[PDB]
Symmetry: C2
Subunit: 596 residues, 2 copies
């Protein structure tokens, strides 16, 4: 059907030295170069290292963007056996965990995300080096099975553009209505030295730890790892349901360069057509774009071609010069193949959340072959406020939203581009759910076992501290914890009328205090029998309804913590609080590996 606006309602990711998107923000804002030495637990690089570029069965770098705890997993959470976990590619494991976390971040459970179960799964992947083989379809299908998704389920491989192709397909699927909700993302892990030997034989990699995006002396990219997932939802429905929205994808395109002077040589004309077509489909004039996250792999050939293409595409709409900032996240985390597009999307969404532009590293001296004074763009060098541009298109002047474009190009010539606009809410702050000591909030927490629940409490205290959450967040926090977390076997619940009170009681719990006022502990495992026989009848769900109205909070929580199912939505008779991001489940970190 027709192009329409698509909301991003959920986000999770793991990047070098960034186990969550908060760390990613800290790395971006500070201009951190996240490249490190090949960990000994991957292989010993000295055995294979040779300065001779292009040599066979060798490599000329010691560097990569490696994530921590690559081999860890919580198989019991998913009722997967340890042997099966050993046999599962860790790429599948990590995408599964990030998608689950992204669902928690949105504030939904697997059941309520989509009642029809028509949730699509689209995943980009291009490397399959685990010893048990490439099994890309299973990265999607494992998710669809475990989470009861009955929409499309597909693994895509378009090389370096794979995750942006996947996003494009997801937008198509939402437009045609075969999915009402969708998971989109990509994954790439470096699990075997042959990964580096192949890239080294074609001399595509830099020897150094610097991806010099648009910088002088460009000599290839630094290889990287990444895993990310986003939840996509129609904008109108996202507004109606009160979800929190990182941004609105207005449109995208993917294409290929066709025949150029040599295989893997990029074609600037096709890139220009790509970007022009994305802008036309989005109905976005190029002059309103104020940041461009480039592919920016740091090769001497590709960067000038890219800038020529961008200049040609923008010059179709405007002759204005140096109005749009340009940068690349690869300067921080390196080039991560199938996850490069999702990493760039994440950076754009974080910039929108913080309304900030971060440094693009290693471009203090610009490519001497690129005359930026002849272009629409200024390469972003320092942390700066991201300004809404004021623009006189058509001799009419208006303020436009912060809008960014992102391009992603594959080695085989497959290109994609996506247009992302800030979401600007309507100013409705009735605040009729004001949480006070007279109208306290119900905070519920649960986990598979006591260790995980304890870690959940620690992470909540830390998150409240980190983001300076206070009384005005209690309503949204409690609502999100009520309706946006699966109620697991080990449960606690706290009544609090102020943030300080919550911090006090939770710290006392963390501190080992056996008896805490208005804090209840218990397990579902114990009272399974009586639960089964009483909840069948609505008669008792009505009794709960009356307890809630009357405010018998202590009673409901004493029963809830033993396993009594409570429809927390009935707690909000008039209106609804908003969903907010909160920390996600701290999966157990146990190592599993096979033998080749």
């Amino acid at each position: 059907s027709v192009v329409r606006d698509v909301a991003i309602i959920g986000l999770s990711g793991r990047y070098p030295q960034a186990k969550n998107v908060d760390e990613f923000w800290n790395r971006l804002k500070e201009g951190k170069n996240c490249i490190s030495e090949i960990p000994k637990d991957r292989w010993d690089w000295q055995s294979f290292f040779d300065e001779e570029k292009g040599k066979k069965e060798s490599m000329y770098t010691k560097w990569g963007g490696f994530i921590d705890d690559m081999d860890k997993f919580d198989p019991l959470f998913f009722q997967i056996s340890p042997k099966e976990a050993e046999e599962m590619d860790p790429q599948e494991r990590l995408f599964l965990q990030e998608a689950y976390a992204s669902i928690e971040d949105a504030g939904y459970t697997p059941t309520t995300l989509c009642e029809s179960r028509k949730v699509g799964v689209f995943v980009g992947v291009m490397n399959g080096n685990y010893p048990t083989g490439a099994t890309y379809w299973s990265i999607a299908n494992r998710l669809s099975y475990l989470l009861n998704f009955q929409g499309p389920s597909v693994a895509v491989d378009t090389a370096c553009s794979a995750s942006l192709t996947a996003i494009h397909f997801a937008l198509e699927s939402l437009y045609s209505g075969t999915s009402e909700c969708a998971i989109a993302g990509g994954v790439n892990l470096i699990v075997d030295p042959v990964h580096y030997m192949k890239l080294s034989a074609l001399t595509m990699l830099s020897p150094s730890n610097q991806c010099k995006s648009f910088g002088d002396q460009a000599d290839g990219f630094v290889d990287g790892e990444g895993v990310g997932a986003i939840v996509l939802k129609p904008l109108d429905k996202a507004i109606a349901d009160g979800d929190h929205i990182y941004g609105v994808i207005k449109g995208s395109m993917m294409n290929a360069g066709g025949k150029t002077n040599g295989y893997t040589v990029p074609n600037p004309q096709a890139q220009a057509q790509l970007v022009a077509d994305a802008l036309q489909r989005a109905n976005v004039h190029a002059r309103t774009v104020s940041y461009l996250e480039a592919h920016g792999t740091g090769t001497e050939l590709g960067d000038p071609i890219e800038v020529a293409g961008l200049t040609r595409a923008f010059e179709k709409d405007t002759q204005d010069k140096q109005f749009c900032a340009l940068g690349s996240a690869k300067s921080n985390i390196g080039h991560c193949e199938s996850a490069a597009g999702i990493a760039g999307v994440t950076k754009i969404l974080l910039q929108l959340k913080h309304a900030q532009l971060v440094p693009s590293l290693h471009s203090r001296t610009l490519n001497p072959n690129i005359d930026f004074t002849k272009t629409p763009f200024v390469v972003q060098q320092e942390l700066a406020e991201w300004r809404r541009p004021i623009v006189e298109i058509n001799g009419t002047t208006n303020e436009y939203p912060r809008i960014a474009g992102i391009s992603s190009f594959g080695a085989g010539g497959s290109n994609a581009h996506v247009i992302i606009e800030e979401y600007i809410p309507e100013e409705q702050k009735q605040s009729s759910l004001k949480i006070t000591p007279q109208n306290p909030a119900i905070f519920v927490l649960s986990a598979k076992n006591a260790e995980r629940l304890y870690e959940i409490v620690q992470q909540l205290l830390a998150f409240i501290q980190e983001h300076s959450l206070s009384d005005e967040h209690l309503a949204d926090m409690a609502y999100t914890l009520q309706v946006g977390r699966v109620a697991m076997e080990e449960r606690i619940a706290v009544i609090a009328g102020t943030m300080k009170e919550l911090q006090q009681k939770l710290t006392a719990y963390v501190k080992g205090q056996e008896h805490i006022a208005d804090l209840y502990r218990g397990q579902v495992n114990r009272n399974q029998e009586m639960l089964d026989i009483l909840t069948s009848d609505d008669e008792l769900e009505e009794t709960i309804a009356r307890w809630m109205e009357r405010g018998k909070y202590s009673k409901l929580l004493d029963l809830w913590v033993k396993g009594l199912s409570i429809d927390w939505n009935k707690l909000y008779q008039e209106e609804q609080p908003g969903r907010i991001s909160l920390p996600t489940y701290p999966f157990a970190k146990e190592s599993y590996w096979t033998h080749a």
Copy 2:
């Protein structure tokens, strides 16, 4: 604007799974500049590829 959609699910050759190149080599050699993608949906993979092609034709890309 010729699209290429190919279903594949096994990558056991000694130099590795390089599924993207099965499509991109074709698009390069024949000067095709439409979408070029390797899809893996296991057994149904080629019919998934057909489904994608039908969509792509429907939207006019």
